Amino acid sequence: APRSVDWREKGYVTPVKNQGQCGSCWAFSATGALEGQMFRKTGRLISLSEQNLVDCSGPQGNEGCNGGLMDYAFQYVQDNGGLDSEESYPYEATEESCKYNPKYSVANDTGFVDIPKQEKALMKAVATVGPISVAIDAGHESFLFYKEGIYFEPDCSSEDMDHGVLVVGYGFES
Amino acid sequence: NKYWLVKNSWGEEWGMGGYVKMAKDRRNHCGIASAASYPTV
Amino acid sequence: XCXY
């Protein structure tokens, strides 16, 4: 695979969003990946509604601001036949009744792919697919107060991931 | 010296414009490759 | 933040 990849350079990534005091990171990670795939498909980058996911994907297994999984959100989009734009269904940072409206749907999917649990496999996916949804162990003050450079935490775990985020590429420092 | 370019959802003031460089090829650091997926479109 |  290439030495370096940065999908932001190619228009696959929307500006950084803020989930606030709500455990809806799984929804942001999901909209991030969908945003990247829809762009690859249509050439148009449109911000997607995390609120839509927070309020409506309970049947698929998500728990709104109490947590969830990106795969459950992808399953919701597939079951629902769509997902509203961020503009049509603004983020509120708290769970509300489902207000999905098909007229405002700008995205859809036909399932999801779980990447083999190996960094080499993740690299191939990022290189050939685009931004990838992932979960990481962010349960450390070192992550909360991260400032710059390559993040490395000795006490990090590969078993208790608690934060859903988006890998938009990879590279190396000089 | 390798890293994964990660986009966070805690606003653009946190980290590097809302992004974080995470250790890559360091024994699946922080489980970054343990729950990775993407939607099929 | 978390909640994955």
Short mmCIF file of all heavy atoms in Angstrom, two decimals, chain A residues 5-6 8 13 16 29 122 126 131-136 143 146 149 151 163-171, chain B residues 3-11 14-24 29-30 32:
data_model
loop_
_atom_site.label_atom_id
_atom_site.label_comp_id
_atom_site.label_asym_id
_atom_site.label_seq_id
_atom_site.Cartn_x
_atom_site.Cartn_y
_atom_site.Cartn_z
N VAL A 5 -1.15 8.23 3.24
CA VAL A 5 -2.50 8.45 2.75
C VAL A 5 -3.18 9.54 3.59
O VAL A 5 -3.05 9.54 4.81
CB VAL A 5 -3.37 7.17 2.85
CG1 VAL A 5 -4.81 7.51 2.47
CG2 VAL A 5 -2.83 6.08 1.92
N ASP A 6 -3.88 10.46 2.93
CA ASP A 6 -4.59 11.53 3.62
C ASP A 6 -5.82 11.90 2.81
O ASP A 6 -5.74 12.73 1.89
CB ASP A 6 -3.70 12.76 3.80
CG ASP A 6 -4.32 13.81 4.70
OD1 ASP A 6 -5.56 13.78 4.91
OD2 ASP A 6 -3.57 14.69 5.18
N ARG A 8 -8.22 13.72 3.42
CA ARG A 8 -8.64 15.11 3.52
C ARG A 8 -8.21 15.88 2.26
O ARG A 8 -8.87 16.81 1.82
CB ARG A 8 -8.02 15.78 4.76
CG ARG A 8 -8.43 15.16 6.10
CD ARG A 8 -7.72 15.85 7.26
NE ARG A 8 -6.27 15.79 7.08
CZ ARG A 8 -5.38 16.29 7.94
NH1 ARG A 8 -5.78 16.90 9.05
NH2 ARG A 8 -4.08 16.20 7.66
N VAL A 13 -13.50 14.31 3.45
CA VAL A 13 -13.76 14.63 4.86
C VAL A 13 -14.37 16.01 5.16
O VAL A 13 -13.89 17.04 4.66
CB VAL A 13 -12.43 14.47 5.64
CG1 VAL A 13 -12.66 14.54 7.16
CG2 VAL A 13 -11.77 13.15 5.24
N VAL A 16 -14.28 19.27 11.25
CA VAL A 16 -14.43 18.59 12.54
C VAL A 16 -15.72 19.02 13.28
O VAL A 16 -16.05 20.20 13.36
CB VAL A 16 -13.20 18.88 13.44
CG1 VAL A 16 -13.40 18.24 14.82
CG2 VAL A 16 -11.92 18.34 12.78
N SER A 29 -18.60 8.83 14.16
CA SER A 29 -17.71 7.95 13.44
C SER A 29 -18.44 7.37 12.21
O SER A 29 -17.88 7.28 11.11
CB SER A 29 -17.26 6.80 14.33
OG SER A 29 -16.43 5.89 13.62
N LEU A 122 -6.10 -3.00 8.27
CA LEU A 122 -6.66 -1.66 8.37
C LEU A 122 -5.99 -0.73 7.34
O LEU A 122 -6.66 0.06 6.66
CB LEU A 122 -6.47 -1.10 9.78
CG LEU A 122 -7.00 0.32 10.00
CD1 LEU A 122 -8.47 0.41 9.61
CD2 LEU A 122 -6.80 0.70 11.45
N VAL A 126 -7.90 1.46 4.52
CA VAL A 126 -7.81 2.92 4.42
C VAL A 126 -7.25 3.34 3.04
O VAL A 126 -7.72 4.29 2.43
CB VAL A 126 -6.90 3.51 5.51
CG1 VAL A 126 -6.76 4.99 5.31
CG2 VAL A 126 -7.48 3.24 6.88
N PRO A 131 -11.97 6.87 4.26
CA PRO A 131 -12.01 6.95 5.72
C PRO A 131 -12.69 5.70 6.32
O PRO A 131 -13.72 5.22 5.81
CB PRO A 131 -12.80 8.23 5.96
CG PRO A 131 -12.39 9.07 4.82
CD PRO A 131 -12.48 8.11 3.66
N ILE A 132 -12.13 5.20 7.41
CA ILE A 132 -12.62 4.00 8.07
C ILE A 132 -13.06 4.25 9.53
O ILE A 132 -12.34 4.91 10.31
CB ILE A 132 -11.51 2.90 8.08
CG1 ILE A 132 -11.06 2.61 6.64
CG2 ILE A 132 -12.02 1.63 8.76
CD1 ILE A 132 -12.15 2.04 5.72
N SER A 133 -14.23 3.74 9.90
CA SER A 133 -14.69 3.89 11.29
C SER A 133 -13.90 2.95 12.20
O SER A 133 -13.68 1.77 11.87
CB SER A 133 -16.19 3.56 11.43
OG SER A 133 -17.03 4.58 10.92
N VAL A 134 -13.44 3.46 13.34
CA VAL A 134 -12.71 2.61 14.27
C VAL A 134 -13.02 2.98 15.71
O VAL A 134 -13.58 4.06 15.99
CB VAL A 134 -11.16 2.68 14.09
CG1 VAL A 134 -10.76 2.37 12.65
CG2 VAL A 134 -10.65 4.07 14.50
N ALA A 135 -12.68 2.08 16.62
CA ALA A 135 -12.86 2.32 18.04
C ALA A 135 -11.51 2.26 18.71
O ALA A 135 -10.70 1.40 18.38
CB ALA A 135 -13.79 1.28 18.65
N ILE A 136 -11.26 3.17 19.64
CA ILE A 136 -9.98 3.17 20.33
C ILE A 136 -10.16 3.34 21.82
O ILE A 136 -11.21 3.79 22.28
CB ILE A 136 -9.07 4.32 19.87
CG1 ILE A 136 -9.79 5.66 20.06
CG2 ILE A 136 -8.65 4.12 18.43
CD1 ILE A 136 -8.85 6.88 20.08
N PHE A 143 -5.00 11.20 26.49
CA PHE A 143 -5.77 11.39 25.27
C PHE A 143 -6.59 12.69 25.36
O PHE A 143 -6.63 13.47 24.41
CB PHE A 143 -6.74 10.24 25.01
CG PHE A 143 -7.45 10.33 23.68
CD1 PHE A 143 -6.80 9.94 22.51
CD2 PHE A 143 -8.73 10.85 23.58
CE1 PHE A 143 -7.42 10.07 21.25
CE2 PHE A 143 -9.37 10.98 22.33
CZ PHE A 143 -8.71 10.59 21.17
N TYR A 146 -4.23 15.52 24.82
CA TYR A 146 -3.30 15.36 23.70
C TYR A 146 -3.14 16.70 22.99
O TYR A 146 -4.13 17.40 22.77
CB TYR A 146 -3.84 14.33 22.70
CG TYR A 146 -3.14 14.36 21.35
CD1 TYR A 146 -1.89 13.77 21.17
CD2 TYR A 146 -3.74 14.99 20.27
CE1 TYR A 146 -1.25 13.80 19.93
CE2 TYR A 146 -3.12 15.03 19.03
CZ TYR A 146 -1.87 14.44 18.86
OH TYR A 146 -1.28 14.46 17.61
N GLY A 149 1.99 15.71 17.84
CA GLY A 149 2.92 14.60 17.70
C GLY A 149 2.19 13.27 17.67
O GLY A 149 0.96 13.21 17.65
N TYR A 151 0.62 10.13 19.19
CA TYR A 151 0.09 9.70 20.47
C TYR A 151 0.46 8.24 20.82
O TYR A 151 0.14 7.33 20.07
CB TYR A 151 -1.44 9.82 20.49
CG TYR A 151 -2.07 9.35 21.79
CD1 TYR A 151 -1.92 10.09 22.96
CD2 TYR A 151 -2.80 8.16 21.85
CE1 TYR A 151 -2.49 9.68 24.16
CE2 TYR A 151 -3.38 7.74 23.06
CZ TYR A 151 -3.22 8.51 24.21
OH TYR A 151 -3.81 8.14 25.40
N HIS A 163 -14.05 4.65 22.60
CA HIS A 163 -14.29 5.85 21.80
C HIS A 163 -14.30 5.62 20.28
O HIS A 163 -13.30 5.23 19.70
CB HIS A 163 -13.25 6.91 22.14
CG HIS A 163 -13.51 8.24 21.52
ND1 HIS A 163 -14.78 8.78 21.44
CD2 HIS A 163 -12.67 9.18 21.02
CE1 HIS A 163 -14.70 10.00 20.92
NE2 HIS A 163 -13.43 10.26 20.66
N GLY A 164 -15.43 5.91 19.64
CA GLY A 164 -15.52 5.71 18.21
C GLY A 164 -15.00 6.93 17.47
O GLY A 164 -15.43 8.04 17.73
N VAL A 165 -14.06 6.71 16.56
CA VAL A 165 -13.48 7.78 15.76
C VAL A 165 -13.33 7.39 14.28
O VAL A 165 -13.80 6.33 13.87
CB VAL A 165 -12.12 8.23 16.33
CG1 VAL A 165 -12.33 8.83 17.73
CG2 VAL A 165 -11.15 7.06 16.38
N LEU A 166 -12.66 8.24 13.51
CA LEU A 166 -12.49 8.01 12.07
C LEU A 166 -11.05 8.09 11.58
O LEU A 166 -10.40 9.13 11.74
CB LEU A 166 -13.32 9.04 11.30
CG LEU A 166 -13.45 8.92 9.78
CD1 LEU A 166 -14.42 7.78 9.44
CD2 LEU A 166 -13.96 10.24 9.21
N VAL A 167 -10.55 7.01 11.00
CA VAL A 167 -9.21 7.04 10.44
C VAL A 167 -9.31 7.60 9.02
O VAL A 167 -9.96 7.00 8.17
CB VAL A 167 -8.56 5.64 10.39
CG1 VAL A 167 -7.28 5.67 9.58
CG2 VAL A 167 -8.24 5.17 11.80
N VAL A 168 -8.71 8.76 8.77
CA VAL A 168 -8.77 9.36 7.45
C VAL A 168 -7.46 9.23 6.68
O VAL A 168 -7.28 9.85 5.64
CB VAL A 168 -9.14 10.85 7.50
CG1 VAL A 168 -10.49 11.03 8.19
CG2 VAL A 168 -8.02 11.65 8.19
N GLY A 169 -6.55 8.43 7.21
CA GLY A 169 -5.29 8.23 6.52
C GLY A 169 -4.22 7.73 7.45
O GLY A 169 -4.49 7.29 8.58
N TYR A 170 -2.99 7.79 6.98
CA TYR A 170 -1.84 7.37 7.77
C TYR A 170 -0.55 7.92 7.16
O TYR A 170 -0.54 8.33 6.00
CB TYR A 170 -1.79 5.84 7.86
CG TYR A 170 -1.62 5.13 6.54
CD1 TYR A 170 -0.36 4.97 5.96
CD2 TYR A 170 -2.73 4.61 5.86
CE1 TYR A 170 -0.20 4.30 4.76
CE2 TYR A 170 -2.58 3.95 4.65
CZ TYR A 170 -1.31 3.80 4.10
OH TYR A 170 -1.15 3.15 2.89
N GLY A 171 0.51 7.96 7.96
CA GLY A 171 1.76 8.48 7.44
C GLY A 171 2.88 8.29 8.45
O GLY A 171 2.78 7.44 9.33
N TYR B 3 2.16 6.68 12.04
CA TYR B 3 0.92 7.01 12.73
C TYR B 3 -0.32 6.94 11.84
O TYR B 3 -0.25 7.01 10.61
CB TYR B 3 1.03 8.42 13.32
CG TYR B 3 1.11 9.50 12.26
CD1 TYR B 3 -0.04 9.99 11.63
CD2 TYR B 3 2.36 9.98 11.83
CE1 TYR B 3 0.05 10.92 10.60
CE2 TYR B 3 2.46 10.90 10.79
CZ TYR B 3 1.30 11.37 10.18
OH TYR B 3 1.40 12.28 9.15
N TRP B 4 -1.46 6.78 12.51
CA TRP B 4 -2.76 6.79 11.86
C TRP B 4 -3.31 8.21 12.01
O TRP B 4 -3.27 8.77 13.11
CB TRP B 4 -3.74 5.83 12.56
CG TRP B 4 -3.37 4.39 12.51
CD1 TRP B 4 -2.84 3.64 13.53
CD2 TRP B 4 -3.52 3.50 11.40
NE1 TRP B 4 -2.65 2.35 13.11
CE2 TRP B 4 -3.05 2.24 11.81
CE3 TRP B 4 -4.00 3.66 10.09
CZ2 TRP B 4 -3.05 1.13 10.95
CZ3 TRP B 4 -4.00 2.56 9.24
CH2 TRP B 4 -3.52 1.31 9.68
N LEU B 5 -3.80 8.80 10.92
CA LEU B 5 -4.38 10.15 10.98
C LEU B 5 -5.82 9.99 11.44
O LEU B 5 -6.64 9.48 10.69
CB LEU B 5 -4.39 10.79 9.58
CG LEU B 5 -4.05 12.28 9.37
CD1 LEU B 5 -4.94 12.80 8.27
CD2 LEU B 5 -4.20 13.10 10.63
N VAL B 6 -6.13 10.38 12.67
CA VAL B 6 -7.48 10.19 13.15
C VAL B 6 -8.28 11.47 13.39
O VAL B 6 -7.81 12.41 14.03
CB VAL B 6 -7.48 9.37 14.46
CG1 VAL B 6 -8.90 9.29 15.02
CG2 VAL B 6 -6.93 7.96 14.21
N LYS B 7 -9.51 11.46 12.87
CA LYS B 7 -10.43 12.57 13.06
C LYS B 7 -11.30 12.31 14.31
O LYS B 7 -11.99 11.29 14.38
CB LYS B 7 -11.35 12.71 11.84
CG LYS B 7 -12.20 13.98 11.84
CD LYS B 7 -13.28 13.91 10.77
CE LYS B 7 -14.07 15.21 10.70
NZ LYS B 7 -15.34 15.05 9.92
N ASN B 8 -11.25 13.22 15.28
CA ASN B 8 -12.04 13.08 16.51
C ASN B 8 -13.33 13.92 16.39
O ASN B 8 -13.53 14.63 15.39
CB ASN B 8 -11.20 13.53 17.73
CG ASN B 8 -11.82 13.11 19.09
OD1 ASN B 8 -12.80 12.34 19.15
ND2 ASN B 8 -11.23 13.60 20.18
N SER B 9 -14.20 13.81 17.38
CA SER B 9 -15.45 14.55 17.35
C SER B 9 -15.65 15.37 18.63
O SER B 9 -16.75 15.43 19.18
CB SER B 9 -16.63 13.59 17.14
OG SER B 9 -16.65 12.58 18.14
N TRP B 10 -14.55 15.97 19.11
CA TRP B 10 -14.55 16.81 20.29
C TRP B 10 -14.28 18.29 19.95
O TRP B 10 -13.76 19.04 20.77
CB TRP B 10 -13.50 16.32 21.29
CG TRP B 10 -13.79 14.96 21.90
CD1 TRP B 10 -14.92 14.21 21.74
CD2 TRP B 10 -12.94 14.21 22.78
NE1 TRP B 10 -14.83 13.04 22.47
CE2 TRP B 10 -13.62 13.01 23.11
CE3 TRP B 10 -11.66 14.43 23.31
CZ2 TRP B 10 -13.06 12.04 23.96
CZ3 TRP B 10 -11.11 13.46 24.16
CH2 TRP B 10 -11.81 12.29 24.47
N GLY B 11 -14.64 18.71 18.74
CA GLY B 11 -14.41 20.09 18.35
C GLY B 11 -13.03 20.27 17.76
O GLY B 11 -12.17 19.40 17.91
N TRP B 14 -9.59 20.80 20.41
CA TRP B 14 -8.90 19.63 20.99
C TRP B 14 -7.79 19.10 20.05
O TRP B 14 -7.97 19.10 18.83
CB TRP B 14 -9.91 18.50 21.26
CG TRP B 14 -9.25 17.21 21.73
CD1 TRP B 14 -8.95 16.87 23.02
CD2 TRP B 14 -8.77 16.13 20.90
NE1 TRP B 14 -8.32 15.65 23.05
CE2 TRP B 14 -8.19 15.17 21.77
CE3 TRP B 14 -8.77 15.89 19.52
CZ2 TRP B 14 -7.62 13.98 21.30
CZ3 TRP B 14 -8.20 14.71 19.05
CH2 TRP B 14 -7.63 13.76 19.94
N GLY B 15 -6.67 18.65 20.61
CA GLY B 15 -5.59 18.10 19.78
C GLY B 15 -5.13 19.02 18.67
O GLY B 15 -5.00 20.24 18.87
N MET B 16 -4.86 18.44 17.49
CA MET B 16 -4.40 19.19 16.32
C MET B 16 -5.57 19.53 15.38
O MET B 16 -5.86 18.79 14.43
CB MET B 16 -3.35 18.37 15.56
CG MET B 16 -2.07 18.12 16.35
SD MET B 16 -0.86 17.08 15.50
CE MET B 16 -0.22 18.23 14.31
N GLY B 17 -6.24 20.65 15.65
CA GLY B 17 -7.38 21.01 14.82
C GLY B 17 -8.46 19.93 14.90
O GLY B 17 -9.23 19.73 13.96
N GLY B 18 -8.52 19.21 16.02
CA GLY B 18 -9.53 18.18 16.20
C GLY B 18 -9.08 16.80 15.77
O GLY B 18 -9.84 15.81 15.86
N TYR B 19 -7.84 16.73 15.31
CA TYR B 19 -7.22 15.50 14.85
C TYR B 19 -6.13 15.00 15.79
O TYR B 19 -5.60 15.76 16.60
CB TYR B 19 -6.57 15.72 13.47
CG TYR B 19 -7.56 15.76 12.34
CD1 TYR B 19 -8.32 16.89 12.07
CD2 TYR B 19 -7.77 14.62 11.56
CE1 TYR B 19 -9.27 16.89 11.06
CE2 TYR B 19 -8.70 14.61 10.56
CZ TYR B 19 -9.45 15.73 10.31
OH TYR B 19 -10.39 15.66 9.31
N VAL B 20 -5.81 13.72 15.67
CA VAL B 20 -4.76 13.14 16.47
C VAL B 20 -3.95 12.11 15.67
O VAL B 20 -4.51 11.29 14.92
CB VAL B 20 -5.30 12.45 17.74
CG1 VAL B 20 -6.44 11.47 17.39
CG2 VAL B 20 -4.14 11.71 18.45
N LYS B 21 -2.63 12.18 15.80
CA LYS B 21 -1.76 11.22 15.14
C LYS B 21 -1.59 10.03 16.07
O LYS B 21 -0.96 10.16 17.13
CB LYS B 21 -0.38 11.81 14.88
CG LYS B 21 -0.31 12.96 13.91
CD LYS B 21 1.12 13.50 13.90
CE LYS B 21 1.27 14.77 13.11
NZ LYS B 21 2.69 15.23 13.18
N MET B 22 -2.13 8.88 15.71
CA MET B 22 -1.93 7.79 16.63
C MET B 22 -0.97 6.71 16.22
O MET B 22 -0.96 6.26 15.07
CB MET B 22 -3.26 7.23 17.07
CG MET B 22 -3.48 7.76 18.46
SD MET B 22 -5.09 7.75 18.96
CE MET B 22 -5.25 6.03 19.45
N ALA B 23 -0.13 6.33 17.18
CA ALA B 23 0.90 5.34 16.95
C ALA B 23 0.42 4.22 16.04
O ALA B 23 -0.60 3.60 16.31
CB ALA B 23 1.39 4.76 18.29
N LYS B 24 1.16 4.00 14.96
CA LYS B 24 0.83 2.97 13.99
C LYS B 24 1.90 1.87 13.98
O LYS B 24 3.10 2.13 14.18
CB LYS B 24 0.70 3.59 12.58
CG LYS B 24 0.45 2.61 11.44
CD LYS B 24 -0.11 3.33 10.20
CE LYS B 24 -0.17 2.42 8.98
NZ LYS B 24 1.14 2.33 8.24
N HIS B 29 -1.90 -0.53 18.86
CA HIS B 29 -1.99 0.44 19.94
C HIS B 29 -3.40 1.02 20.15
O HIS B 29 -4.03 1.53 19.20
CB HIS B 29 -1.01 1.58 19.68
CG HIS B 29 -0.77 2.45 20.87
ND1 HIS B 29 -0.30 1.95 22.07
CD2 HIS B 29 -0.91 3.79 21.05
CE1 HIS B 29 -0.16 2.94 22.93
NE2 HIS B 29 -0.52 4.07 22.34
N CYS B 30 -3.87 0.95 21.39
CA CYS B 30 -5.20 1.42 21.77
C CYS B 30 -6.33 0.71 21.01
O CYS B 30 -7.43 1.24 20.93
CB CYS B 30 -5.32 2.93 21.55
SG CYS B 30 -4.01 3.94 22.37
N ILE B 32 -6.84 0.27 17.87
CA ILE B 32 -7.32 0.97 16.67
C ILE B 32 -7.77 0.02 15.54
O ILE B 32 -8.67 0.35 14.75
CB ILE B 32 -6.24 1.97 16.16
CG1 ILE B 32 -6.86 2.94 15.15
CG2 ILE B 32 -5.04 1.23 15.61
CD1 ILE B 32 -6.07 4.24 15.02
#
